[PDB]
Amino acid sequence: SMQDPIADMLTRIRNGQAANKAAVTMPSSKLKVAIANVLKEEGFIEDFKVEGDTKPELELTLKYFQGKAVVESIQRVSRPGLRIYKRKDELPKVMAGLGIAVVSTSKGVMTDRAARQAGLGGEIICYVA
Amino acid sequence: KIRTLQGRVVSDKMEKSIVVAIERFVKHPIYGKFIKRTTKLHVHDENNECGIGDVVEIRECRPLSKTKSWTLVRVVEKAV
Amino acid sequence: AIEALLHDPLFRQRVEKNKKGKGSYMRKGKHG
Amino acid sequence: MVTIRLARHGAKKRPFYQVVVADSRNARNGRFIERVGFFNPIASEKEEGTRLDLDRIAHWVGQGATISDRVAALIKEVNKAA
Amino acid sequence: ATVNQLVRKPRARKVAKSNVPALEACPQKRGVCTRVYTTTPKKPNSALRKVCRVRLTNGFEVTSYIGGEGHNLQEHSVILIRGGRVKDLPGVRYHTVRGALDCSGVKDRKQARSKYGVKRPKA
Amino acid sequence: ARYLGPKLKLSRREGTDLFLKSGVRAIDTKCKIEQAPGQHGARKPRLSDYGVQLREKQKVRRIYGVLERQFRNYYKEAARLKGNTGENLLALLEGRLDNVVYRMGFGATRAEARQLVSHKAIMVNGRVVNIASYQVSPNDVVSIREKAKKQSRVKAALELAEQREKPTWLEVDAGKMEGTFKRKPERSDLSADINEHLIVELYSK
Amino acid sequence: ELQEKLIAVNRVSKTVKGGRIFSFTALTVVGDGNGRVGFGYGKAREVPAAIQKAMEKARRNMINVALNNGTLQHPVKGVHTGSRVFMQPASEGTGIIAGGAMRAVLEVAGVHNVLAKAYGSTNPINVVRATIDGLENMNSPEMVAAKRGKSVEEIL
RNA sequence: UACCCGCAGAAGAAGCACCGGCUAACUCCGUGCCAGCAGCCGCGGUAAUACGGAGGGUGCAAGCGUUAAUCGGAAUUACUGGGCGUAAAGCGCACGCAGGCGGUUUGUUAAGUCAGAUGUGAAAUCCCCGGGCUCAACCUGGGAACUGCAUCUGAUACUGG
RNA sequence: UUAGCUAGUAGGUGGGGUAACGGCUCACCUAGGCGACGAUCCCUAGCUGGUCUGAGAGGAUGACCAGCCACACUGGAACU
Ligand SMILES: [Mg+2]
Ligand SMILES: [Mg+2]
Ligand SMILES: [Mg+2]
Ligand SMILES: [Mg+2]
Ligand SMILES: [Mg+2]
Ligand SMILES: [Mg+2]
Ligand SMILES: [Mg+2]
Ligand SMILES: [Mg+2]
Ligand SMILES: [Mg+2]
Ligand SMILES: [Mg+2]
Ligand SMILES: [Mg+2]
Ligand SMILES: [Mg+2]
Ligand SMILES: [Mg+2]
Ligand SMILES: [Mg+2]
Ligand SMILES: [Mg+2]
Ligand SMILES: [Mg+2]
Ligand SMILES: [Mg+2]
Ligand SMILES: [Mg+2]
Ligand SMILES: [Mg+2]
Ligand SMILES: [Mg+2]
Ligand SMILES: [Mg+2]
Ligand SMILES: [Mg+2]
Ligand SMILES: [Mg+2]
Ligand SMILES: [Mg+2]
Ligand SMILES: [Mg+2]
Ligand SMILES: [Mg+2]
Ligand SMILES: [Mg+2]
Ligand SMILES: [Mg+2]
Ligand SMILES: [Mg+2]
Ligand SMILES: [Mg+2]
Ligand SMILES: [Mg+2]
Ligand SMILES: [Mg+2]
Ligand SMILES: [Mg+2]
């Protein structure tokens, strides 16, 4: 049934962008939240907002520029059927550095560049142009 | 500083012996998926302390029999 | 020998394609 | 008998010897334990033709390793130089 | 398709058989002209195309095209076949070599001489 | 291993002056430089993408007088080396000994230079170098040897050169007949009419 | 200062009560050696006329591409009908490594340095379209900075 | 012997394939679906740039063609990197063991994972910077690499327990 | 379009043997062991460093050079 929450989140973001919706709400998860934060930092969304106690719903607010959408591409890379791990040499360059790659390291989820700087690789979560 | 493996026991009908599946979680070469690949080993045990479906830690030694070159060091999680 | 020879294929009826005819259409010309 | 000796590795007519530690029974160019320098007879001016890793050779000798006559000569030469 | 599926059963290379099997990975092969004859090419062409049934050295029986204008090949003549094929002919997958063994070079030829076993004209 | 035949024909084919003759007398007088060689000379078919590149390649090869395998090797070398590839190739071509000699002005033509090199007249750092294809490095002095200094052809060549445009990457002296290869040439310092990119593309093909 | 190639010219038919009626289609592409490119598919009963038409078409409906120096900014995939097309920037000196219709569009555009592959169909009209699409979609570092609201040095 | 020095005299030293399109290179004569060509498409039936000869040209060059055999193009077995309403492709429909995948929170572990280290990964070969044979090929000094395995010491986001 | 294979067979005890552990061998005792992660059977093949090709991932390959293996007219056997 429901097997990759992260993937689902990404799809939600994509569809919202397509449809020119302002806001995307979904179930929150720690990893998801982290991802959202990362996105915000990298300027791909306007803001995120968690809300609720028992079953909290993350609510991201999508960003547009001169009409068209900002989140141009947002692919998963690791995925439950085939996970991916990269060593700090092998971390990829999305859109030749113009986009980002969210990567989960032992020092938290971060963007690929950040990881590289740190000097450590990790499970690659998703590319986002 | 002893190289050892922890496996589920599979069968113990033969005396002073067991056979112990050792699951190793390898990456595939081409496809990059991780598979569980299984290594059944014959393991020498005196006293016949092991049961079936039991978690057991072993070590590699001098060959006891034709098939048998491993000897168990400790048992864990024996009976359901 | 005469008879069978006649029967053999080298002496089959020949017909030619047409250039302005009915079955004329050349998709690609001889030369570019 | 583990022997420090030469090993012909060059062109035709332009030999370049590797000096090596080898079980005697192995072939000239074949299997060796360690390569402990080198030697060039056809050495131009303003370049080192010979160069030996002397500590390693000493160690090998200690272990109980014979030295080929040419290798001995080379060693002697090197010592003279230094 | 699915990575799991591929793991289970990996994907297989399309094993392409050779169109010149008598050769058996040899660039030529010698053999004797069982018989020699003319054939008709398949539509739309017209000719009497000259072609010999050759028993090869390695046990095979093939038939070979004889290029150029004219040829001396008889029964019990020993020739060198090479992998080549006249398209128009059903079942001919081999060219004779002109000028190798008993076969002679084409008479009176002055362009692409090599390909028909002809020596350079004298001067 | 050399092109021996008619020189101006090649030039005609190319469409340019390849400098295959000394330059005493202007190429337009010696041949129909505009009309390409042969029975179907006047006719100008429209050249394909493949064709143009090939032509360009030929031109370059013709200019320096180099056969295909060697050219290919040079290209490969250029590719291997760092930076721009076409430029590198050009530099390599320049670097050849005969070419250098020609530039200096001891050859009237590049062919002449090559001949000189062959015939044991050209010393590179005071050691006789006989091979045309020999690369000349930076700060390598290159001279006519004393036996070959008396030849009237050499002085003629020098004179011719003096009329021609002088290269910046060399420094040459007429009385001593020795020149110094100062630095590998920049692309700008060579002729713009050659398009090295095309050649690169061809070899990629 | 439009430099322009005719990529491909092709005969096309229409059958009628009498018989086959021929025509020609030309496919040109014009570029300025900088940002601007456009393609023109023209059709006429005689070739030259068709070509002219194509040229005319090309000259209007041009398109601006952001170019880093003489190359693409970053790797890009353009697609259209059968042909799908990958093209990736490269080092000064590599040249236009590209096949057919695709090469032509690049040349006029004023890319001088690409590795380009055309997967799928290589149907000239479609592949040129694909290439154009790819070029169009491709955005610069400056462009992305604006989008994300950061410095160009932060985007790097 | 390499190498050098002298001697004479343009002297002893250019061929092979191709030129319809793909594919760089075109005309005349002979033939007349013949004789022949041909990798594919396809030439030849009396004006053949596609056969054979010539002249002319193009490409390679002490070689040049043909064949055989591999990878490439072929994203045409598609891990990177394809597909399946109609082009080949969704079991007739379920249930279900093995198998694969698994919502959310905490703790813990540290197997995967990541980092660093130590041992090893023979030399040669490949690549980088050099050196030596007049140059090159060739030889050669040092490095890098050999994407791995094993252990030890850490990290704990993600997966696993 | 090879699904079952194996009785020194799987394990134990004790003797004997080996330079050495060991069903290596023998006598007794248990009835195992291997197998859909492909056992068994059939066809082909010396393995590696490398080599060719390829943008790479791969694919094909294993002349020379070097490492390991095996064979020495065929089948056996030990002696030194
Ligand atoms: Mg591991
Ligand atoms: Mg001496
Ligand atoms: Mg040569
Ligand atoms: Mg380069
Ligand atoms: Mg058409
Ligand atoms: Mg297709
Ligand atoms: Mg042409
Ligand atoms: Mg022919
Ligand atoms: Mg006539
Ligand atoms: Mg005629
Ligand atoms: Mg006719
Ligand atoms: Mg002809
Ligand atoms: Mg072939
Ligand atoms: Mg493939
Ligand atoms: Mg193929
Ligand atoms: Mg398909
Ligand atoms: Mg169907
Ligand atoms: Mg159905
Ligand atoms: Mg989970
Ligand atoms: Mg599970
Ligand atoms: Mg660990
Ligand atoms: Mg590690
Ligand atoms: Mg040198
Ligand atoms: Mg090595
Ligand atoms: Mg957990
Ligand atoms: Mg015993
Ligand atoms: Mg005993
Ligand atoms: Mg065999
Ligand atoms: Mg490929
Ligand atoms: Mg024997
Ligand atoms: Mg024999
Ligand atoms: Mg025997
Ligand atoms: Mg015997």
Distance B41 CA to I40 C1' (A): 21
| D74's tokens | 């080379």
**CB-strand contact F146/H, under 7 Å:** no
Phi and psi for G15 in degrees, rounded to 5? Answer: -100, 140
CATH at residue E118: 2.40.50.140
Separation of alpha carbons E96 and E71, rounded Å: 11
Q: In this structure, what token pair is assigned to residue F25? A: 């007398």
Q: Which helix (H) or strand (E) holds C23?
A: none
How far, in Å, CA of F105 to CA of B4, rounded? 80
CATH of the domain at G140: 3.30.230.10
Show me where the domains of chain D are located. Answer: 1-81
| Orientation of helix G101-109 relative to helix G124-137, angle to 10° | 40
CA distance F1 to F68: 10
Q: C1' nearest to CA of D44: which nucleotide?
A: H132
The protein residue nearest nucleotide H83, judged by CA to C1', is E1
Query: What is the distance, to the nearest Å, from the Cα of residue B62 to the centroid of all Cα atoms in its chain?
Result: 16
CB proximity E2 to B under 8 Å: no
Compute the Cα dihedral for B39, B42, B43, B45 and give only its sign: positive
d(CA F132, CA E53): 56
The answer to whether the beta carbons of residues A27 and A57 sit under 8 Å apart is yes
Longest dimension (CA), chain B: 45
How far G91 CA sits from the closest chain F CA (Å)? 8
Task: Return residue ranges of chain A for CATH 3.30.1370.30.
Answer: 5-69
Residue E43, classed as helix, strand or coil, is coil
- G30 neighbors G59 (Cβ within 8 angstroms): yes
End-to-end CA distance of chain C: 48
CB atoms within 10 A of CB E35: 12
State both tokens at G104. 């032509």
| Experimental technique for the deposited model | cryo-EM
Residue type, A125: I
Task: Indicate whether G69 and G54 sit together in one domain.
Answer: no
At A28, list the tokens.
């929150």
Tokens 């001919």 — which residue? E92
CA distance E64 to E93: 7
Evaluate whether G151 touches G141 at the Cβ level (below 8 Å): no
- Peptide bond between residue G89 and the one before it cis (omega within 30 degrees of 0): no
Domains F7-93+190-204 and F94-180 share a fold: no
The crossing angle, in degrees rounded to 10, of helices F196-204 and F49-64 is 120
User: At a CB cut-off of 8 Å and minimum separation 6, what does F164 contact?
Assistant: F23, F105
Nearest C-alpha neighbor of D65 from the set D18, D6, D1: D1
- The DSSP string of chain D is -EEEE--B-S-SSS--EEEEEEETTS-SSS--SEEEEEE-SSPPTTS-S-EE-HHHHHHHHHH-EEE-HHHHHHHHHHHHH-
Tell me, rounded to whole angstroms, the distance of Cα G139 from its chain centroid: 16
Is B56:B28 a contact under the CB 8 Å cutoff?
no
Compute how many other C-beta atoms are within 10 angstroms of the C-beta atom of residue A126.
24
Residues of A in contact with E2 (CB under 8 A): 81
| Composition of chain C by helix, strand, coil, percent to 5 | 30, 0, 70
Burial category of C7 from C-beta neighbours within 10 Å (exposed 0-12, middle 13-18, buried 19 and up) = exposed
Name the domain count of chain B: 1
- The CA F88 to ligand 23 mean position distance, Å, reads 19
Domain boundaries, chain F: 7-93+190-204, 94-180
User: Does residue G26 sit in the same domain as residue G77?
Assistant: no
**What would be the CATH architecture of the domain defined by F94-180?**
Roll (3.10)
Q: Running DSSP on this structure, what letter comes out for residue C10? A: G
Find tokens 């360059």 and name the residue. A93
Give the domain extent around G98. 64-148
How much is the CA Rg of chain A, to the nearest whole Å? 14
CATH of the domain at G49: 3.30.160.20
Q: Which domain holds residue E99?
A: 1-123
Residue type, E52: C
**On chain H, which bases lie within 7 A of the protein's CB atoms?**
4-6, 14-27, 33-45, 49-50, 52-62, 64-70, 74-79, 82-84, 99-106, 111-116, 122-123, 127-129, 131-135, 138-142, 150-152, 154-159
Q: What DSSP string describes chain B?
A: ---EEEEEEEE--STTEEEEEEEEEEEPSSS--EEEEEEEEEEE-SS----TT-EEEEEE-S--SSS--EEEEEEES---
G154 is a domain residue = no
Q: Could you tell me which of B16, E75, E49, B18 has the C-alpha nearest to residue B8?
A: B18
Helix H or strand E encompassing E90: none
Judge whether F181 and F136 are in contact, CB under 8 Å: yes
**Distance in angstroms (rounded) separating the CA atoms of residues G72 and G96:** 11
Q: In what order do the strands lie in the sheet with G3-15?
A: G3-15, G20-31, G37-44
- Which letter does DSSP use for residue F96 in this model? B
Q: To the nearest whole angstrom, how far is the Cα of G13 from the nearest Cα of chain A?
A: 42
DSSP string across A86-109: E-TTT---GGGGTSEEEEEETTEE
**Which residues have CB under 8 Å from A78's CB, separation 6+?**
A84, A85, A123, A124, A125, A126
CB-CB contact of B56 with B11 (8 Å): no
Instruction: Strand D51-52: give its sheet, edge to edge.
Output: D51-52, D34-39, D17-23, D2-5, D65-67
Give the span between the Cα atoms of F86 and F91, in whole angstroms: 9
Give the contacts of G70 (CB within 8 A, at least 6 positions apart). G92, G110, G111, G112, G113
> Within 10 Å of residue E76's Cβ, how many Cβ atoms?
8
Specify the number of domains making up chain G: 2
Contact E46 C14 (CB under 8 A): yes
Give the span between the Cα atoms of G72 and G75, in whole angstroms: 7
Q: Check contact B-A (3+ Cβ pairs < 8 Å).
A: yes
- Alpha-helix residue ranges (DSSP H) falling in chain F: 7-14, 27-30, 49-64, 68-80, 85-95, 97-104, 110-118, 152-163, 196-204
Interface of A with G (CB under 8 A): 42-44, 65, 70, 95-99, 113
Q: Collapsing DSSP states into helix, strand and coil, what is residue E96?
A: strand
For the domain made up of F7-93+190-204, the CATH class stated in words is: mainly alpha
CATH number of A74-128: 3.30.1490.10
Asked if the structure places residue G155 within a domain, the reply is no
| DSSP letters spanning E50-63 | EEEEEEETTS-EEE
Pick the CATH number of A5-69 from 2.70.170.10, 3.40.50.80, 3.30.1370.30, 3.40.50.11440: 3.30.1370.30
Whether G58 contacts G48, CB under 8 Å: no
User: Is G144 found in the same domain as G76?
Assistant: yes
DSSP state for residue C1 in the 8-state scheme: -
Distance of alpha carbon D6 from alpha carbon D71, whole angstroms: 7
Q: Which amino acid is at F131?
A: I
